[PDB]
Design a protein around this ligand. Structure first.
Ligand SMILES: Cc1c(Oc2ccccc2OCCn2ccc(=O)[nH]c2=O)cc(N(C)C(=O)CF)c2ccc(C#N)cc12
Lengths: 547, 400
């Protein structure tokens, strides 16, 4: 016999202060018991388990469906935490084309990885005897049990340690491990590739691990995690939008799932309205009528999802490019590619929940997201194509009160273009009228007043019902914008209104703020000055609006 | 040569912080560095039984083309037991201070066995292809708060001759940095620094004297417009929260009437007297401003434009312990984030020199932008805490 190299065991402990499992065995039928006695006899003959005496106080229930299934949920609750086998799943767009990709089944290596001997006593299980007239058969696991908490991590780390020298001494190939399957790709000639595959089978056999000489079942196109992987391209598994006369909540969640999933390769997918219908529902069986905007959006989705679209694989020798388009209502779409017309992947970005916003902030956020995703997938930041003029961005970031930055980018003339809709002046305007505004409300009756007085003697006070102080302050500014010329100075005491306008929004939840924005767009020059209230600053007439 | 027992605070488990994604060049740099360190025994590979993790990335210090390994030990530091020197109050009063990187010395002292598993870090893989290379430290790691505490005895033994030779030189230690303050000439200071580095070998010009606190100043004008007076009344009203006797009613008396903003208004005599009294009040220091070692230090930064940034360090509102204006231009003329990161590093350094601890920052930047880009310009061995302010503060121009 050729000596088999031993696989180093991983020291495993339980959670601190806890004890091993002690669960009552399920009573089983005579046929199930016989089947489990046969299966466990074979496994004991193979070395996966071993008989134990009565000194072992721990027990884990066993089942059969034969097939033996051990319910390790309690031992999983009591087992230590392990380092995650995978922090995330790879993305197909990050893969690199290979001339040959072979799949090796290392499933027989799963039960060949030994378990820490001091931990085996916690895997004890009992087969009930026939009619329970004898003591049940006591077994314990000598290898990693399927279903135990630490089996995938210990298995993957052991396989990694085994594969390390082979991968090191063969840099001209690529080895990946996923569950009980290995994937070996290379650009070598097919003969050399099969040769190095045989070399890998031998190297794995030096640990007693057997790879089947049988032709593997997996073959192109690989269907994996909702993906189709082809020799030269990748895509998502076929997305079919069903034809429904009426749509419930689970139909809309399945449709937004198919659309979110399809958005990574199909450009232009929008999910704003369909997901908007699911706002604050929390009822799975509730039928919700479909808005017209959801109908137009769904029709555009069916038009985009008409024919199949594929993504290419990553070529590290070419540059990485990400182009962004605005779609309206806080929706953005982007394509990541290296050659024109051939996308690596696509995606979308929806604006965050906010009371006020502008297009430039949303574009900045989208760029940050794309940067993070690209570093995840390809390890580098892509060069951007953005629908915004260089001068627009320069004005924005130079005048913005926050610090901001986007990486290397170039302007692409793809409307709608992100633009600055208004810019406040830095100094007062000579020759322009000066509107001193103010507003006030009663906290009980919700009655208020908003108005202004100007340096030319122009005045206005308007009474308002069902309003607040903040509302009357905004309303006062709005009145000043309404009744002034193209250039106007505005003096307020509202730190609230100044806080809103200095954030430079172009859209808002409040219709009043949107009206103020629409007024600011029409102006040529607007200077907004702030003063402390109730300090006797004339012109600023608090008494005129508190009547 | 002998390990000192180290433990965690009661009831606290080890750190389990997600490793953030890295570029390919930083990953390769960390692979080379960690390979060399593993050959030197400073780190060792670990198995899946170690669930703890601390983030890691790579930087390039000033005047160097070699990559350096930075470990974000913040979570482990706040989870590590408190170790137990009064802060040298004369270090900030010295004319000049030089910062030295003494992090290599820590690697000569082994780390406590049972504690090593808490220093675990992960070199990540691109696109989650491989599980990532996991390591743990066998010696004192740079960035961990226990490293200077454990090495304090050895450091005292190494610095004992130099301290006995020059009683006029102040020596402070914080994390992996050694601050050496003196009053000599720049050439004599550099030769003395070479003397200390060759003294440490066989075993950053900073001038706090050119730093002072900044008072509130008011404009001096011969003609005042309505807008000028309005801004003056606003700034004095803001200053009245800090200084008691600030009075504005005589100046607000001039704003009576609805006048154009650009209209010149002559000051009455009562307004001039009020303004002069206010200047005199602003010339004095703030009443009852003390430092409390039991409280956190808070640092606020405002972007003033044109590469200018203002900052305040305080513990209670309107009780500023330090104020300053960083306007330095060093290869960041087109990058706001780089300027902000350098500003945070300088303010943290000053705070280390003055109080011996780092402040908590309030950064005028969106969380996603900062968290996306700050590691690209970071050059310090320590990392402070920070939060993000999303509403524009009115007081910005009152610090300009
Ligand atoms: C075929 C395959 C993977 O493919 C490669 C394996 C080795 C080298 C390079 C490779 O991809 C290059 C691109 N490529 C792709 C396909 C092709 O036919 N030709 C190609 O050139 C990678 C995977 N993933 C994501 C892993 O994590 C594996 F651990 C897989 C996961 C599940 C299944 C199934 N069922 C198949 C996988």
């Amino acid at each position: 016999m050729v000596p088999i190299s031993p696989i180093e065991t991983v020291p495993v402990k339980l959670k601190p202060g806890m004890d091993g499992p002690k669960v009552k065995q399920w009573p089983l039928t005579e046929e199930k018991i016989k089947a489990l006695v046969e299966i466990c006899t074979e496994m004991e003959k193979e070395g996966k388990i071993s008989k134990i005496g009565p000194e072992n106080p721990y027990n884990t229930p066993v089942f059969a469906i034969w097939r033996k299934l051990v319910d390790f949920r309690e031992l999983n609750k009591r087992t230590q935490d392990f380092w995650e086998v995978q922090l995330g799943i790879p993305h197909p767009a990050g893969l690199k084309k290979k001339k040959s990709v072979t799949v090796l089944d290392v499933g027989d290596a799963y039960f060949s990885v030994p378990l820490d001997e001091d931990f085996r006593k916690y895997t004890a299980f009992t087969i009930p005897s026939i009619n329970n007239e004898t003591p049940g058969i006591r077994y314990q696991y000598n290898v990693l049990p399927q279903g135990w908490k630490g089996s995938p991590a210990i298995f993957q780390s052991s396989m990694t340690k085994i594969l390390e020298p082979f991968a090191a001494q063969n840099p001209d190939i690529v080895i990946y491990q996923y569950m009980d399957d290995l994937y070996v790709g290379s650009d070598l000639e097919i003969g050399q590739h099969r040769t190095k595959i045989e070399e890998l089978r031998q190297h794995l056999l030096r640990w007693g691990l057997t790879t089947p000489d049988k032709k593997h079942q997996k073959e192109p196109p690989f269907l994996w995690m909702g993906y189709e992987l082809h020799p030269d391209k990748w895509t998502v598994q076929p997305i079919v939008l069903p034809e429904k006369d009426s749509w419930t909540v689970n139909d809309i969640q399945k449709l937004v799932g198919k659309l979110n999933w399809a958005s990574q390769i199909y450009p232009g997918i929008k999910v704003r309205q369909l997901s908007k219908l699911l706002r604050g529902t929390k009822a799975l069986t509730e039928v919700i009528p479909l808005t017209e905007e959801a109908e137009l959006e769904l029709a555009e989705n069916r038009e985009i999802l008409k024919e199949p679209v594929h993504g290419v694989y990553y070529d590290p020798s070419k540059d990485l490019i990400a182009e962004i388009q605005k779609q309206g209502q806080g929706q953005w779409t982007y394509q990541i590619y290296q050659e024109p017309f051939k996308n690596l992947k696509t995606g979308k970005y929806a604006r965050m929940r906010g009371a006020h916003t502008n297009d430039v902030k949303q574009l900045t956020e989208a760029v940050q997201k794309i940067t993070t995703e690209s570093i995840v997938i390809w390890g580098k930041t892509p060069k951007f194509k953005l629908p915004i003029q260089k001068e627009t961005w320069e004005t924005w970031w130079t005048e913005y009160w926050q610090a901001t930055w986007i990486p290397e980018w170039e302007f692409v003339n793809t409307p709608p273009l992100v633009k600055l809709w208004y810019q406040l002046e830095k100094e007062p305007i000579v020759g322009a009228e000066t509107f001193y505004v103010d507003g006030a409300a009663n906290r009980e009756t919700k009655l208020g007043k908003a108005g202004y007085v100007t340096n030319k003697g122009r005045q206005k006070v308007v009474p308002l019902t069902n309003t607040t102080n903040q509302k009357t302050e905004l309303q006062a500014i709005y009145l000043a914008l309404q009744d002034s010329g193209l250039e106007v100075n505005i003096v307020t005491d509202s730190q609230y209104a100044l806080g809103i306008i200095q954030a430079q929004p172009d859209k808002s939840e409040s219709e009043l703020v949107n009206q103020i924005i629409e007024q600011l767009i029409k102006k040529e020059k607007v200077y907004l000055a702030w003063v402390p209230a109730h300090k006797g600053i004339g012109g600023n007439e608090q008494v005129d609006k508190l009547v | 040569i002998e390990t000192v027992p180290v433990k965690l605070k009661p009831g606290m488990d080890g750190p389990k912080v997600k490793q953030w994604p890295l570029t390919e060049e930083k990953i390769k740099a960390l692979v080379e560095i960690c390979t060399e360190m593993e050959k030197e025994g400073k780190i060792s590979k670990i198995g899946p039984e170690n669930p703890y993790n601390t983030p890691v990335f790579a930087i390039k210090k000033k005047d160097s083309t070699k990559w350096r390994k930075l470990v974000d030990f913040r979570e482990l530091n706040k989870r590590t037991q408190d170790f137990w020197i009064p802060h040298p109050a004369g270090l900030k009063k010295k004319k000049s201070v030089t910062v030295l990187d003494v992090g290599d010395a820590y690697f000569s002292v082994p780390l406590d066995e049972d504690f090593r598993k808490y220093t675990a870090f992960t070199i990540p893989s691109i696109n989650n292809e491989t599980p990532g290379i996991r390591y743990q430290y066998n010696v004192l790691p740079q960035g961990w708060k226990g490293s200077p505490a454990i090495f304090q005895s050895s450091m005292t033994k190494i610095l004992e001759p130099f301290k006995k030779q020059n009683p006029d030189i102040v020596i402070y230690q914080y994390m992996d940095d050694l601050y050496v303050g003196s009053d000599l000439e720049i050439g004599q200071h550099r030769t003395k620094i070479e003397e200390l580095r060759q003294h440490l070998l066989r075993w950053y010009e900073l001038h706090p004297d050119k730093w002072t606190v900044q008072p509130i100043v008011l404009p001096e004008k011969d003609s005042w417009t309505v807008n000028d007076i309005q801004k003056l009344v606003g700034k004095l009203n803001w200053a009245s929260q800090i200084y008691p006797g600030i009075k504005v009613r005589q100046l607000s008396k001039l704003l009576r009437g609805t006048k154009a903003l650009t209209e010149v208004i002559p000051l009455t005599e009562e307004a001039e007297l009020e303004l002069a009294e206010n200047r005199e009040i602003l010339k004095e220091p703030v009443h009852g401003v003390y430092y409390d070692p039991s409280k956190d230090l808070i640092a606020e930064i405002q972007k003033q434009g044109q590469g200018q940034w203002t900052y305040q360090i305080y513990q209670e509102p309107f009780k500023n312990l330090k104020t300053g204006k960083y306007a330095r231009m060093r290869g960041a003329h087109t990058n706001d984030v780089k300027q902000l990161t350098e500003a945070v590093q300088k303010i943290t350094t000053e705070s280390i020199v003055i109080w011996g601890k780092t402040p908590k920052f309030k950064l005028p930047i969106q969380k996603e932008t900062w968290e996306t880009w700050w590691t690209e310009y970071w050059q310090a061995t320590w990392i402070p805490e920070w939060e993000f302010v999303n509403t524009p503060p009115l007081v910005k121009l009152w610090y300009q």
